[PDB]
Design a protein around this ligand. Structure first.
Ligand SMILES: [Zn+2]
Ligand SMILES: [Zn+2]
Ligand SMILES: [Zn+2]
Ligand SMILES: [Zn+2]
Lengths: 72, 78
DNA sequence: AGTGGAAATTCCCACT
DNA sequence: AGTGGGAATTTCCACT
């Protein structure tokens, strides 16, 4: 039912993990980019539908911990 | 050496009663004339600086209010 | 000649 | 995959 990163409604199994649409594109863009994100808090931000855009660092870290990878 | 009391960017003057940068100036103007119902993803004490000030509108707005920013500030003056 | 409004324009991102 | 919005810079305004 739900995205394993933000708990929004999932669309399918993207990059190896059940995710929503925005989390898919975000992950792609993050890995392909020269992207070193930095948390403004404690590296433990709440990632949900409303807040997920607040911290790319914690969102990216949740993507990786969930096992996402450009190979399915 | 004068820096934005909200995000430590380079300050551009005293705006709304407080030493701040152009971006924090208009962020505050935007936040107070509109609805400002932001939600913090951390614990309402996020670090606000030039690279991160976009992460948490909630804490940024909070630092603006805590610093004393207010639209009516220049108007007094008397 | 020097400050600080607000508006306008441009730039940057999110999700669709 | 094009509309919408947020952020940030640039500009012009009144008043010293
Ligand atoms: Zn998601
Ligand atoms: Zn975070
Ligand atoms: Zn600032
Ligand atoms: Zn915050």
């Amino acid at each position: 039912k739900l995205c394993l990163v933000c708990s929004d409604e999932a669309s399918g199994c993207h990059y190896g993990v059940l995710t929503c649409g925005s989390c898919k594109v975000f992950f792609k863009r993050a890995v392909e980019g020269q992207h070193n994100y930095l948390c403004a808090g404690r590296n433990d931000c709440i990632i949900d539908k409303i807040r997920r855009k607040n911290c790319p660092a914690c969102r990216y870290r949740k993507c990786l911990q969930a096992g996402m990878n450009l190979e399915a």
